[PDB]
Each structure stands twice: as structure tokens, then as C-alpha cells.
């Protein structure tokens, strides 16, 4: 039993600390309601993911018996969900609420938090059918109430509820739930909760191919300005992919890059790869070459390899390399649900090559164009070369009769007005950040004006004495 004894020390140490931790959190929720301002609620909620994996069956068992001291229905059904710890010789009376507090019914906020915990622990427990049932009880209750502080906690409960169905692989069943919730979220409430809902309702559309009706919701529904800087990261990504599939590339790149910089740095490493993967594909379609810095990061080296090799063929005008790169890694493109965007790169592989070929040569034989671009024939080279001229890919015209593509000497770009346009873009935003910087400057000043230099009584007393002697 030596091995069991060693495990007992670790288990006992962990549960005691967290149990005290839950008590600290609950007081914050009571504090937030006590002060009538919902800001405190986030203080316990933020740590919720960190403490998510720091709870055991023993931890939860006391909580249900501890916080819900009143003989509520919870003990009727909550106990069977969670395995009861065996009779322990070292038993202590753990009552978070004493006297009137224990008898007094738990507030909705504390009620939401605790129930939020049991589902969370169950999720780590892999039990789903049970989680959904409990989730339904927790979710059904918070809809009936209309407390202002409950919205913040409800937001989290809103999210994890969908996750429960995710492992349940239902999705469709929960869609109407969010749509209705966003229905009440906009009007009955006004913010801080529909941000989480919008991402969730948006997510279900992406999980399937339901892009057609997904774009409808974005165009109509708006998003709160106060999105906690965490929900905003998801909103940009999903909205980035929606525009990505519909040829709205220009805003696709800007939306994602904004999501990238607003995305958490230290954690959320899993979704950094997915956001990066789509951005490099969206950039490639646009034509701009993605930066090489993020193909060398420790957490992106392996993931981006199937996409780094792609950028090797796209950057080089040759088309055969792209085809030879597709057959090698086509499967992983299937696996990541992005192959749809790659099969449309064949046009870009020609546009880039024709751009460089027309940039480096001045009068190249029409047949020679096909060989360098692996066009497979000279007859069709004219059209794409001809077509490339219309869109503005290259400038100079072609000699149909002779059979050579000529290029115009495009020099002295500085005189043109384009450099001023490029400077306006940088100038406008650079002058923007300074305005924002002053925005946070007027917050810090708070009760910092009453600061006497040396003193008040000492100066006054000395002056009066000197004046009397000055006269005589």
C-alpha cells in the first residue's frame, strides 16, 4: 500500500487548496451583486479555465453538499450524477455558508457558477449524455431569470453548452437554441452576451458547408464593441473564412491578420495554426507572398510544412510544380477542410509566372512562353497571355502575326502619384494610434491632485512674523 499512500498526499493537498479557492470565487460573485456592478464577476470567471482541470470527484462532492446546504432538489439528483466518496476516517465539517447563510437560498450567480462546474468536470470525464442533461437544467434556469450580472456568467454557460453537444455531435439540435437566445440577447439584454452567442451560432454554420446562409447572418447581424478582446478573435477568423470562400479575398486577409494580433499569444496555440494556415492560403490567392518568419516558429514548423511546400510552387511561376505538390499533400488539404481553396490556385500560379516572365524579358517568343510556364501548348498561351493583359497583370501588348509577346519599359515610378497613396495609408493609421494612445492617457489620472509641496501652516506662520518686524 506504499504506492497508494504516496498518491494520497498529492490528492489531499490539491483538493484542500482548490476548495478554499472556490470559496474565494463565490464571495466575488456575491461581491459583484452586493456592489450592484457586474465587473467583479470576470475576476473569478477568468481563472475558470485554469481551475477547470483542478477539480476531482471529492472536490465537487463537498461543493454540492457545501454550498447547497438547503435541502434543495440538487441532492435528489445531483448526487447520483457524481460518484460519492467512500467513508473517510479523516472527515471534517466543510460548510462554506454558516448559520443564516447556509439556510438562505443560493443566489442565481453562485447557482450558475456551481452548476457550470459540474458540467465542466463531466466534460473532462468524457461523460456526455449526463452532461447534456445537467447542462439543460443549468441552461434552462438562466434563461428564465433576467439579472444583469447573470449575463456575464451565462455567456460562459452559453458556450460550454454548445461544446457539450459538440461531443454529442448534435449541432443541429442546438442551433435553434442559440438563434432564439440571440433573439433575446439583442433586445432583452443589450451586450456582453450576444458576442459569445454570435460566434457560437456562427460556428455551427461553418462546421457544415452552410456557407450560403452563413454570409447572410454576418451581413445583417452586428457585433458589440465590447467583445472582451477574446470573443473578437473568433469572430474575425470565422468571418475571415466566410469571405475567403466567396472570392472576397481583399477583406479576408485584413480580417484574419486583425484576428491574429488580437488572438492570445501565450496560449490558444492550437487555433494559431488554423488561423495561420488559412491566411497563407488567402494571401497566395491574392498574390502577395506570405512572410517567411512564421514558417520557422517552434509551434508552426510541422503544421505549415504541407502549406510551405505549396508556397514553393505558387511563388515559382511553373505550373507543374503546383500540380506535383497537390498530389503529394492533397489528403491533408482534405483533412483540414481547406482543399476547396487550393484547387483554385492554378490561376495564380500562372499570373505570378506571367508577371515575372513579362518582368524579366522584353520580347519573348510565344512558343517559349509555354515551355517556361509548362502551358503544354502554344495555341492556348496567347489567350491567357492575352487575358492576363486585360486584368492588368502585365502591361505591354502582343504581336499576333509575328508571335512574340513584348513588354513595355515601366520605369520612373516615383513621379507617379502611387507613392503618395502608399504614404497616406501609413500616415492615416500612424496618426491613428497616437489618438488612441491619448485615449488611455486620461484614465490613469485619479485622485492625484491633492499633493502639498512642503506644508501649509509652516509657511503661513513664518510670513506673518516677518511682516510685523518689517514695518518696524
Amino acid at each position: 500500500k506504499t504506492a497508494a499512500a504516496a498518491a494520497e498526499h498529492s490528492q489531499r493537498e490539491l483538493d484542500t487548496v482548490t476548495l478554499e479557492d472556490i470559496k474565494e470565487h463565490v464571495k466575488q460573485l456575491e461581491k459583484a451583486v452586493s456592489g450592484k456592478e457586474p465587473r467583479f464577476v470576470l475576476r473569478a470567471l477568468r481563472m475558470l479555465p485554469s481551475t477547470s482541470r483542478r477539480l476531482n470527484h471529492y472536490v465537487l462532492y463537498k461543493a454540492v453538499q457545501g454550498f447547497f446546504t438547503s435541502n434543495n432538489a440538487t441532492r435528489d439528483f445531483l448526487l447520483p450524477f457524481l460518484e460519492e466518496p467512500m467513508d473517510t476516517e479523516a472527515d471534517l465539517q466543510f460548510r462554506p455558508r454558516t448559520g443564516k447563510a447556509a439556510s438562505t437560498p443560493l443566489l442565481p450567480e453562485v447557482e450558475a457558477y456551481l452548476q457550470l462546474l459540474v458540467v465542466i468536470f463531466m466534460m473532462n470525464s468524457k461523460r456526455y449524455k449526463e452532461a447534456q442533461k445537467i447542462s439543460d437544467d443549468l441552461m434552462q434556469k438562466i434563461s428564465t431569470q433576467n439579472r444583469r450580472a447573470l449575463d456575464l456568467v451565462a455567456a460562459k454557460c452559453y458556450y460550454y453548452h454548445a461544446r457539450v453537444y459538440e461531443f454529442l455531435d448534435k449541432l443541429d439540435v442546438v442551433r435553434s437554441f442559440l438563434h432564439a437566445r440571440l433573439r433575446t440577447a439583442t433586445l432583452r439584454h443589450d451586450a456582453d452576451g450576444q458576442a459569445t452567442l454570435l460566434n457560437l451560432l456562427l460556428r455551427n454554420y461553418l462546421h457544415y458547408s452552410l456557407y450560403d446562409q452563413a454570409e447572410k447572418l454576418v451581413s445583417k447581424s452586428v457585433f458589440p464593441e465590447q467583445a472582451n478582446n477574446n470573443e473578437w478573435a473568433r469572430y474575425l477568423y470565422y468571418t475571415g473564412r466566410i469571405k475567403a470562400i466567396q472570392l472576397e479575398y481583399s477583406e479576408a486577409r485584413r480580417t484574419m491578420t486583425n484576428a491574429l494580433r488580437k488572438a492570445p499569444q501565450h496560449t490558444a496555440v492550437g487555433f494559431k495554426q488554423t488561423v495561420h494556415k488559412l491566411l497563407i492560403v488567402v494571401e497566395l490567392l491574392l498574390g502577395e507572398i506570405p512572410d517567411r518568419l512564421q514558417f520557422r516558429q517552434p509551434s508552426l514548423k510541422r503544421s505549415l510544412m504541407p502549406y510551405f511546400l505549396l508556397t514553393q510552387a505558387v511563388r515559382t511561376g511553373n505550373l507543374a510544380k503546383f500540380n506535383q505538390v497537390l498530389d503529394q499533400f492533397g489528403e491533408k488539404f482534405q483533412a483540414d477542410g481547406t482543399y476547396t481553396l487550393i484547387i483554385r490556385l492554378r490561376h495564380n500560379v500562372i499570373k505570378t509566372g506571367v508577371r515575372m516572365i513579362s518582368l524579366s524579358y522584353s520580347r519573348i517568343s510565344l512558343a517559349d512562353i509555354a515551355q517556361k510556364l509548362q502551358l503544354d501548348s502554344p495555341e492556348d498561351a496567347e489567350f491567357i497571355v492575352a487575358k492576363a493583359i486585360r486584368d492588368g497583370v502585365i502591361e505591354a501588348s502582343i504581336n499576333h502575326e509575328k508571335g512574340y509577346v513584348q513588354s513595355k519599359e515601366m520605369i520612373d515610378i516615383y513621379s507617379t502619384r502611387e507613392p503618395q497613396l502608399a504614404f497616406h495609408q501609413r500616415i492615416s493609421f500612424c496618426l491613428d494610434i497616437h489618438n488612441m494612445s491619448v485615449k488611455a492617457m486620461r484614465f490613469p489620472p485619479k485622485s492625484y491632485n491633492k499633493d502639498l509641496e512642503s506644508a501649509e501652516e509652516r509657511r503661513e506662520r513664518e510670513q506673518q512674523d516677518l511682516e510685523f518686524a518689517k514695518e518696524m
Binding site: P49, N230, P264, A268, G270, I289, R292, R302, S303
Partner: protein
């Protein structure tokens, strides 16, 4: 912080032996995947008979 577990985190499986550990001005011109330069030159003289 509020880490996102919904998006799977791909396994790192990285080379922790400091393969490169170099900070340069790396551009995209360093990976043309060409077979060195001596080889191309070496076959050049023989290909043209010189």
C-alpha cells in the same frame, strides 16, 4: 488566460536540439531548392564539350 480548446492543438513534435537557432533578415530567396552551384557548373563544361 482564456485559452481556446475548441480548436485542436496540433502536436509540436519539434526538433529541440537547436537545429538553426539563428536570427537573420531571412527572405524567400534562400530556398530556391537548387542543387548547389558546383554541380550545375561542373556538368556545364562537359555538356557543351568544353
Amino acid at each position: 488566460d482564456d485559452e481556446f480548446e475548441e480548436f485542436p492543438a496540433e502536436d509540436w513534435a519539434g526538433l529541440d536540439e537547436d537545429e538553426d537557432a539563428h536570427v537573420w533578415e531571412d527572405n524567400w530567396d534562400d530556398d530556391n531548392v537548387e542543387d548547389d552551384f558546383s554541380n550545375q557548373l561542373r556538368a556545364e563544361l562537359e555538356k557543351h564539350g568544353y
